[PDB]
Paper text:
Here we report the cryo-electron microscopy (cryo-EM) structures of trimeric extracellular domain of the S protein (hereinafter referred to as S) at multiple states and conformations, including the all [name]-locked, activated, S1/S2 trypsin-cleaved, PD of [name]-bound, and the full-length [name]-bound states.
To investigate the effect of proteolytic processing on the activation of the S protein of [name]-[name]-2, we digested the purified S protein by trypsin, which is referred to as S(p) hereafter for clarity. We solved the structures of the S(p) protein in complex with PD of [name] with overall resolutions of 2.9–3.6 Å, which show different PD binding results from the uncleaved S–PD complex. Three conformations of the S(p)–PD complex were observed. The binding of the second PD to the [name] of S(p) in conformation 2 induces shift of both the NTD in the same protomer and the anticlockwise NTD compared with conformation 1.
Residue numbers in the entry:
A (entry chain A): 742 to 826, 854 to 940, 944 to 1135
B (entry chain C): 298 to 621, 640 to 676, 690 to 790
C (entry chain A): 27 to 67, 81 to 143, 153 to 172, 187 to 247, 264 to 297
D (entry chain C), E (entry chain B): 988 to 1037
F (entry chain B): 742 to 790
Write the structure that this text describes.
């Protein structure tokens, strides 16, 4: 407001404590920016490391695992992300966690999940081979385990080829991170560009009102500048509170996704991608986080004809965990998400009642 | 200073911004470009033959660099009076035109060259207006203008019909007519030739010897500018916070050699957001960058007065060589009063850029906080870990539901039981209605807040 | 005749260096794609707010301008001349020939017939542009000399004009003329209006491109 | 002349009051998010198993 | 004489508009938190079983 | 503020970019209201019958 001039500084004392409030507000929002990062990324107690010999059943994580010959020991995809996105009384404070520390945190999360599944987010990490973990995750979406073990190489090739396309699509999209940078810079520039308005005075310089006016006449002209500059500073401080309350909710959602998609398997629909959630991987970005969601999507459907129950010996039979289907002439049981027909026996069905209350029973 | 900033006698552990550090500017400097046309007065003040008193000369000095100091201190002048403006402030002002009038008079006639006089010289030879502005200079010239036998070439007018208007000039030579009788261009009683001649002779008493006079008259019409003093220029130092003025550009900062290249008509350079960041020195014509004098907040790190009274100090983003033991440089500033160790602990007091401080190793020290203990998992492709026991854990989680419902009467806060103030407050409209409506809506929300958390059950079960 | 400027008559609004910075200004400019008079070889023109003025030749037929309100005595005027020697700025009260010029022996200067009360003196193919303006008793002159590869037609392109002179006269101006060297042995006139432009600054600090922000919706 | 002095007090105190009310509105919105989260935890952690 | 009064009118009318815009900003962030809850409900209660 | 008058516009020009900020603030709000609706309702690839 004054810029090191005792005349303006004494007039300013008449306004009370507005400028202790403004500083309190800005300090309160600069502390919560470090609180925001701490709750997204410090979700581990140990720093887990991955084994030197990396055989994960055909799956290849080399583009998301840390690279020692790179800057800050980042992964290959964490680099594509960091490449894509002094004044008067204004300073910028550094964040408490460096970028090296945050890349360390994400590599510990990523080595915990590649190697222990979801066990490290509930206690001590317990190792399990990667394909058996993949089979547990297939169980979690309602497919049986033999469907993973008999299609291992195909599922691994699809995963590798789909991780290879993230790298192209990014190397060739971070608009939500660019916008928060742009908004803050556009506001800081508007703050400085106001130091050159009169607000109804003879000039914008205090060394020009203190040079062609006597002290009784320069008070009236200095107050017109003080009022304007106070207004502009307080507008800046209100809009930052309103923008920080929005960044806070985004970081609160990121902290929930790190818990529920990276340290677990979610059943919520469309919370960890589109499809059936299998697993998620975190990557650090300039002022945020990227999640890579791996999901299962069913494909290549056929129609069959169905019945709710089967009548036999006067009894009604229902499938234990499947659907009754007909290929035109014969009746089988499948599981509901993957076609794998079986002979209807008394081991995959159960009985209740007689076959005249259900509507749609078939004889078989 | 921390106790004063918090307004308390017990400070709890933390880190507190307490004041600011601002490097002062040792001295100040000015500058300008060499001079060329400093005005060659050595023609009007150094002529071989002056001009009569009845036809004075009139030189119109113009756009130039005038140095009235070489005049003022020359000590060769017997009379140097300044009227509109005292002499020492001439080399610090600028006008539109300077006129210089020159002539030669007797010695004791120099007191009629002044505003508001009378006598044969000021009446009708050379009249100065009554609000004169310039200066009058005069010096004896007996050896140049007076010659044995009498120098009869210096005339003056001794008869005129009416006194001159100021700065008016009259070189006519008509036969004067004193009496009523017409003259018809011939001399006689009451018909006189109007010009007389000083017969100067070298053996004349002072006050009878010739004096040469120059009258400088500064005028200010209504142009855009013109000649003025020769604004000198002092030296210029660099690499020090300084208070500078570059022919108009007033500022503060450190000056440094540049490596940019202006175009040869550009004086100073500006940044985006429009702040001067380079200048060109008028005299030597070299580009110099202007960086601001180091400045930054000061923070105090304390373990808490209930533990110790030692303290460490952070000068924020200041290079630790320009602060005014343990001086330690951080990406966040210069830290004084803590020692740097090589261990890594859990963060205690956050300094920044990965550095924390603690009161451990009875003192204070800095270090790069640790993220946690390292752990390799015994991964292989046919190994599994299965737990054989369990624990039951109970942990707490705390959440704010509500806050204090407060209301303010907008009128009683501002005026407080005064009708003179209340009627003037009516000229702003519905500000207080708006304020009460805003505050009441957030008092209603607080009861909804706790109804939504606690009344989630229909019956009161026992 | 009349012709169309394309992007012509851009001058550096003032000192102060500058680099790559699409800087925005409000000033008196010659709008893009304007209607500029054409003259061949001349008459008394108006001034009313600054003037753009280009000219083309290898010889030197254009030998300065004359300015003022009445171009005679009873009021003051400027006179800017160039014989085969060098420029001669001058400010007196004159008596100007209603058709003033200079010859080419090589004896010349039937320009005026009076030089009274002088209040300022000074003494000492091709495309030669000039911008003349007159604000607060100062008469500013910007100029630029580009080489054409034609002889006498207005070309196309971008070239910013650098300030030349500054004269604290005080003179009023409402009219101006031109001066030509006769035969004894092409020029244009734009006018300036208050516009807003967007200037692109190079890394050396020169204006390389501009945008007139009132031409069309894209601008 | 009482009026010219009273108007500066009115101007300053109005601005004080407006700053107080704006910062209460921004803080009540933060308390509401907390109370919505606590309602969701009461439903999903006390009245069920998550 | 008139510029003095017109500056008072301007000051009042600019204060009113700032009050209006700040409250619209605070009220739109409340509508956004509600549309976010609606999007999650449409995903999780209409496109699946919760 | 001013509203038609011209003595008002030159006086208000002295306050800087106070009015540009307010129009930016209101335009952001209006662009957010369409994204609210796109996020709630356009949650489907095809138009099923
Ligand atoms: C995992 O995939 C990467 C591809 O991103 C493989 O690494 C590259 O393979 C190509 C083809 O042989 C080589 O030209 C590159 O030099 C490899 N290294 C790079 C690009 O850094 C990697 O071999 C795969 N892992 C396994 C076990 O097959
Ligand atoms: C399932 O059977 C239906 C019934 O024929 C198929 O749907 C029809 O497909 C034909 C050809 O694509 C269309 O012309 C009809 O309009 C469809 N609808 C009807 C007849 O109601 C469908 O293609 C079959 N699905 C699969 C996966 O084979
Ligand atoms: C439905 O599937 C059954 C498979 O059980 C098909 O019947 C068998 O088909 C094979 C090859 O055509 C024969 O070798 C068997 O003898 C058939 N019967 C049995 C009991 O296995 C039947 O053709 C399929 N129907 C349709 C319409 O595709
Ligand atoms: C399914 O099987 C039952 C028993 O085999 C069928 O019931 C018989 O249906 C015939 C023809 O309607 C009657 O004449 C018999 O009296 C029925 N017997 C009994 C015990 O109900 C039944 O019709 C079969 N369903 C279909 C669709 O063929
Ligand atoms: C301003 O004056 C100074 C001297 O007062 C000039 O400095 C001279 O610079 C030349 C370099 O070409 C040296 O050879 C001389 O020895 C210098 N003289 C002195 C006394 O140091 C300076 O060049 C002048 N400014 C300009 C722009 O020419
Ligand atoms: C007129 O010219 C003379 C000679 O150039 C100047 O006289 C010099 O005065 C200085 C200071 O009093 C002396 O140091 C010199 O010795 C003088 N010159 C000579 C040759 O001895 C005189 O200053 C000039 N007058 C004015 C008004 O500038
Ligand atoms: C299905 O609809 C058909 C009509 O095409 C009807 O004959 C049959 O009884 C219906 N069956 C069931 C189970 O609804
Ligand atoms: C504070 O002081 C009390 C009594 O002097 C002591 O019991 C307590 O441990 C102290 N707290 C700390 C953090 O040292
Ligand atoms: C402080 O200044 C010295 C002297 O130039 C320099 O060596 C040092 O690097 C500066 N500090 C930092 C943090 O660069
Ligand atoms: C910390 O370790 C480094 C190893 O490079 C060593 O050079 C340095 O002297 C150590 N610091 C102290 C204080 O011992
Ligand atoms: C310039 O204006 C004159 C005025 O009549 C018009 O005749 C002429 O066509 C215009 N020239 C251009 C290029 O628009
Ligand atoms: C050129 O014209 C000026 C105009 O007065 C004149 O002073 C000068 O002497 C002329 N050049 C020559 C060589 O006469
Ligand atoms: C201008 O010239 C005329 C005629 O030569 C003369 O009457 C007048 O006094 C002059 N102007 C001034 C200011 O002397
Ligand atoms: C220029 O002419 C105008 C005519 O309206 C006159 O009012 C003004 O005083 C003149 N300029 C000067 C500097 O006198
Ligand atoms: C001027 O600019 C050109 C191109 O922008 C650059 O190559 C050159 O180094 C600059 N400086 C000069 C020519 O002195």
């Amino acid at each position: 407001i004054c810029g090191d001039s005792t005349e303006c500084s004494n007039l300013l004392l008449q306004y009370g404590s507005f400028c202790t409030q403004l500083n309190r507000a800005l300090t309160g929002i600069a502390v919560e920016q470090d609180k925001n990062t701490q709750e997204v990324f410090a979700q581990v107690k140990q720093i887990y490391k991955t084994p030197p010999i990396k055989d994960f059943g055909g799956f290849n994580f080399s583009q998301i695992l840390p690279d020692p010959s790179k800057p800050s020991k980042r992964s290959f995809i964490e680099d594509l992300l960091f490449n894509k996105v002094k004044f008067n009384g204004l300073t910028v404070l550094p964040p408490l966690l460096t970028d090296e520390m945050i890349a360390q945190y994400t590599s510990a999360l990523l080595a915990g999940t590649i190697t222990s599944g979801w066990t490290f987010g509930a206690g001590a990490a317990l190792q399990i081979p990667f394909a058996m973990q993949m089979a547990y995750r297939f169980n979690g979406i309602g497919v049986t385990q033999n469907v993973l073990y008999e299609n291992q190489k195909l599922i691994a090739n699809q995963f590798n080829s789909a991780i290879g396309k993230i790298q192209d699509s990014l190397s060739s999209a971070l608009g939500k991170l660019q916008d928060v940078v742009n908004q803050n810079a556009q506001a800081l520039n508007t703050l400085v560009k106001q130091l050159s308005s009169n607000f109804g005075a003879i000039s914008s310089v205090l060394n020009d009102i203190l040079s062609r006016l006597d002290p009784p006449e320069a008070e009236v002209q200095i107050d017109r500048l003080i009022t304007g500059r106070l207004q502009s500073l307080q507008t800046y401080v209100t809009q930052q509170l309103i923008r920080a309350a929005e960044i806070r909710a985004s970081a609160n959602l990121a902290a929930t996704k790190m818990s529920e998609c990276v340290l677990g398997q979610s059943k919520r629909v469309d919370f960890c991608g589109k499809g059936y959630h299998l697993m998620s991987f975190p990557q650090s970005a300039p002022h945020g986080v990227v999640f890579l969601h791996v999901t299962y999507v069913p494909a290549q459907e056929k129609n069959f004809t169905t019945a709710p129950a089967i009548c036999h010996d006067g009894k009604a039979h229902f499938p234990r965990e499947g659907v009754f289907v007909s290929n035109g002439t014969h009746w089988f049981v499948t599981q509901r998400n993957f076609y794998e027909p079986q002979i209807i026996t008394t081991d995959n069905t159960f009985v209740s009642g007689n076959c005249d209350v259900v509507i749609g029973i078939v004889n078989n | 200073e921390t106790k004063c900033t918090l307004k308390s006698f017990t400070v709890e552990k933390g880190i507190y911004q307490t004041s600011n550090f601002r490097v002062q500017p040792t001295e100040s400097i000015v500058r300008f470009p060499n001079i060329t046309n400093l005005c060659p007065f050595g023609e009007v003040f150094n002529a071989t033959r002056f001009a009569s008193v009845y036809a004075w000369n009139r030189k119109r000095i113009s756009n130039c660099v005038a140095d009235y100091s070489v005049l003022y201190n020359s000590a060769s002048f017997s009379t140097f009076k300044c009227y509109g403006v005292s002499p020492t402030k001439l080399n610090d002002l600028c006008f539109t035109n300077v006129y210089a009038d020159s002539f030669v008079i007797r010695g004791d006639e120099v007191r009629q060259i002044a505003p508001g006089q009378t006598g044969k010289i000021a009446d009708y030879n050379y009249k100065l207006p009554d609000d004169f502005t310039g200066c009058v200079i005069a010096w004896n010239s007996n050896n140049l203008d007076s010659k044995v036998g009498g120098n009869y070439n210096y005339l003056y007018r001794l008869f005129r019909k009416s006194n001159l208007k100021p700065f008016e000039r009259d070189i006519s030579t008509e036969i004067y007519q004193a009496g009523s009788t017409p003259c018809n261009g011939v001399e006689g009683f009451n018909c006189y030739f109007p010009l007389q001649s000083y017969g100067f002779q070298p053996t004349n008493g002072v006050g009878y010897q010739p004096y040469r006079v120059v009258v400088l008259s500064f005028e200010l019409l209504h142009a855009p500018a013109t000649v003025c003093g020769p604004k000198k220029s002092t030296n210029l130092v660099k690499n020090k916070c300084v208070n500078f003025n570059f022919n108009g550009l007033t500022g503060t900062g450190v000056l440094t050699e540049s490596n940019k290249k202006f175009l040869p008509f550009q004086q100073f350079g500006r940044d985006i957001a429009d702040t001067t960041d380079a200048v060109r020195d008028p005299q030597t014509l070299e580009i110099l960058d202007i960086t601001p004098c180091s400045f930054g907040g000061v923070s105090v790190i304390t373990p808490g007065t209930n533990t110790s009274n030692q303290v460490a100090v952070l000068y924020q983003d200041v290079n630790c060589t320009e602060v005014p033991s343990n001086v330690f440089q951080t990406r966040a500033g210069c830290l004084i009063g803590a020692e740097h160790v090589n261990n890594s602990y859990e963060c205690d007091i956050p300094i920044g850029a990965g550095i924390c401080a603690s009161y451990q190793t009875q003192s204070i020290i800095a270090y790069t906080m640790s993220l946690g203990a390292e752990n390799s998992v015994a991964y292989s492709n046919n190994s599994i870990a299965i737990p054989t026991n369990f624990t039951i854990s109970v942990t707490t989680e705390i959440l704010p539901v509500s806050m204090t419902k407060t209301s303010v009467d907008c009128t009683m806060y501002i005026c407080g039981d005064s009708t003179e103030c209340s009627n003037l407050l009516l000229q702003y409209g519905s500000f207080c209605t708006q304020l009460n409506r805003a505050l009441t809506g957030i008092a209603v929300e607080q009861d909804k807040n706790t109804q939504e958390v606690f009344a989630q059950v229909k019956q009161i079960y026992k | 005749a009349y012709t169309n400027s394309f992007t012509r008559g851009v001058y550096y609004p003032d000192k102060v260096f500058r680099s790559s910075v699409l800087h925005s200004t409000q000033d008196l400019f010659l709008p893009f794609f304007s209607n500029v008079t054409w003259f061949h070889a001349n008459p008394v023109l108006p001034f009313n707010d600054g003037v753009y003025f280009a000219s083309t030749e290898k010889s030197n037929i254009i030998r300065g301008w004359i300015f003022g309100t009445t171009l005679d005595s009873k009021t003051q005027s400027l006179l800017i001349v160039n014989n085969a020697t060098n420029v001669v700025i001058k400010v007196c009260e004159f008596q100007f020939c209603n058709d003033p010029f200079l010859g080419v022996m090589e004896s010349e200067f039937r320009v005026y017939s009076s030089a009274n009360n002088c209040t300022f003196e000074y003494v000492s193919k091709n495309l030669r542009e000039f911008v003349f303006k007159n604000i607060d008793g100062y008469f500013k002159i910007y100029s630029k000399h580009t080489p054409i590869n034609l002889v006498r037609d207005l070309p196309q392109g971008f070239s910013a004009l650098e300030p030349l002179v500054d004269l604290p006269i005080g003179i009023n101006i409402t009219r101006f003329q031109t001066l030509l060297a006769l035969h004894r042995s092409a020029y244009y006139v734009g006018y300036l209006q208050p516009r807003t432009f967007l200037l692109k600054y190079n890394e050396n600090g020169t204006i390389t491109d501009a945008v007139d922000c009132a031409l069309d919706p894209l601008s």
